[PDB]
């Protein structure tokens, strides 16, 4: 037995088996991308129009906007991957998930618990005096509107995850990256527009064009990072023989790697993101435990030692917090990594022999250059690095883009290039072979 | 007049696929079309100025079974080596 | 303890395979500018989509708080 | 036709190979054997330039 | 010689081409030349080894005569003989009439 | 897939959504 009643209960999104074109697709991953940005503009009910600063660090990982609809944004849902990625990782609960129930339970348990978090985050949110005003009955009201708002991300997510292109939660948080950086450069409280009054009124500061020079920095150092090059050819074909007719292979190739260790340091920084969350929120409505606060931000504790140091420029004054931050992040990362093997991953082995069975054929050459077995190594050399093996790697090098700092965040910046990178492709990618394929590969 | 670089253009590819790749084509031995003769000498030591092995053991063997390049045409088989030495390192890649 | 330090060894060998991956010439800036462009491309229309509602949204949040 | 090089002399002549005919199969005709060309007509000129050194030996005497 | 060239809006006189002008974006020497657009054809996209397959019957550029055709000339529709053998470091055709390379 | 019961339109959460808008946008701004 499990949670079944009330799992049942929970509304999930009806999939069609009809027709949906590339268009169709597109357009629906538009609208939702403009119901996300409109929450980011609309602000939630409260009459205290005060509210005491930010969380920095928050906003970035969560793709959310403190202060409007969508405060709580992506939060809740990692936050609940997490929990899943501990229990069934950890061999906890030793789950096999090869049966659609296993699978599906760990699914449908974890959207559950989405859900447990997304109120547990908004109570937790404006407990940790993310508004200023804690009137009990004002408080409930925010409580329902912050949370609510998260939920409508569930069902946003499920909706681009079954009418459209992306996935919702990486859509989100590129969205929210991608905004920050141009509003921030360009808006109406535009950095470039700061730097570039600053040089018309005859005081040039260095400042205002700082944090548009870490970004660029940062996106030039994070898409050098998959640049490489190498190829297999033991496909087969030979169709037309004569080397100036056409060709006779069958031609296979990567260039980019690592690609399913993305979502092990997705939960990485977010679990410092509650962290540093539910330590402010233990603090100032009960003990510390995690750290000591004071002046929004932690001052000491776990929570310190263990909290970001971006957002303009490079913290050079504290090397010991730098130095078990960044330690910390990397294990972190090899962790959530390591639950990413015992907990969703990918396959090599059979990946391998997945291809012979032919190769290409005129019809008339019958492979055997391809070896059915004998190629299971070429894939367990091949996969990882793409569940572990970059996973500190990628942690490492996020972290070291945040010491740089950036805008948008330098580790933000860092998944939403790669978001944006499979994204791209998906918006270009329908095109070509529904002409009936570009062929002869195999 | 003590050595030629002209054989220190020995190289013509490395074999490749299925069977025999495995440690044969990489690591120590490896198996590779080199010159016609061989010469068992600057096949040895132009792999010596490049991973300094003094090759575990310097082999040759012409490469043989059957013609083919339209083999359901004539076929033509020109002959070329498996180098099928084994290096005595295999490290400096 | 061994699985410390056979994980150790398959970092240098993938990185051995990093070496000669290397002189495949992972084009030289070719490759990495073709990720650079269509990156930079996508955070592009993504930020000014966000940008045409947010800045003029908070126009109108501004002159009429 | 009749329109081209500048001539080579047999001090530098000498350069010339040790880069076209020689360390140049440990890279691109090794990496011939490592394929990857969209630049086909590059190595048709690591050819037919070294080919030319031995024409303006024969044909110049070295000049 | 090479008495005519890249440089001529061609008419066409073989039917179901002629009356339709352009230029000649590259001339071809399959007795055809590439003209702009009077070249689309049918074209069952084929399936014989490697193609695409598509859903519909594609149109494709193919080229027409010179055995049978006319260019516009210096104000001239009409062709009035030709030659080459033209100044300069060109070598060009020239008409014949026109007396002038168009 | 999932085990959930209930079927919800991908229209209806998408109308449900600007339910929120509508309601939150002229429950905050637009003070009277």
Known sequence: KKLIPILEKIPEVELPVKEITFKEKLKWTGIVLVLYFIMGCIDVYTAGAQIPAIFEFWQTITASRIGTLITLGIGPIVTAGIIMQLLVGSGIIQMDLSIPENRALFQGCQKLLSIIMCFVEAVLFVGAGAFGILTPLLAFLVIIQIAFGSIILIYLDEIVSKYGIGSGIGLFIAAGVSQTIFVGALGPEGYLWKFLNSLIQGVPNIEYIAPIIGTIIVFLMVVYAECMRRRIVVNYAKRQQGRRVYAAQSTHLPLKVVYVSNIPVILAAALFANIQLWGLALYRMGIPILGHYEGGRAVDGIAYYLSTPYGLSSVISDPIHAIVYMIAMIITCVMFGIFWVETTGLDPKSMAKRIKKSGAFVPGIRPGEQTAKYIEHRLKRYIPPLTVMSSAFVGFLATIANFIGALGGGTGVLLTVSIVYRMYEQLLREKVSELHPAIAKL | MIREERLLKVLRAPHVSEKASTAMEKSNTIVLKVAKDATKAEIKAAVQKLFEVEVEVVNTLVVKGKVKRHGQRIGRRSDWKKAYVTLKEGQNL | TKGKATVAFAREARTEVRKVIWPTRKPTKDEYLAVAKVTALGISLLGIIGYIIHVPATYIKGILK | MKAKELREKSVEELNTELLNLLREQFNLRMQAASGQLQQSHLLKQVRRDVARVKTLLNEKAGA | AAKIRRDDEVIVLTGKDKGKRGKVKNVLSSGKVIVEGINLVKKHQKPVPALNQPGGIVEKEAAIQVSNVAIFNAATGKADRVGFRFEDGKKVRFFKSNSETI | ?32
Do not use: D, M, N
Not at chain 6, 11 to 25: D, K, L, N, S, Y
């Open chain 6, 1 to 32: 897939e999932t085990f959930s019961k209930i079927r919800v339109k991908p229209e209806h959460v998408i109308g449900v959504t600007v339910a929120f808008v509508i309601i939150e946008a002229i429950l905050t701004y637009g003070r009277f």
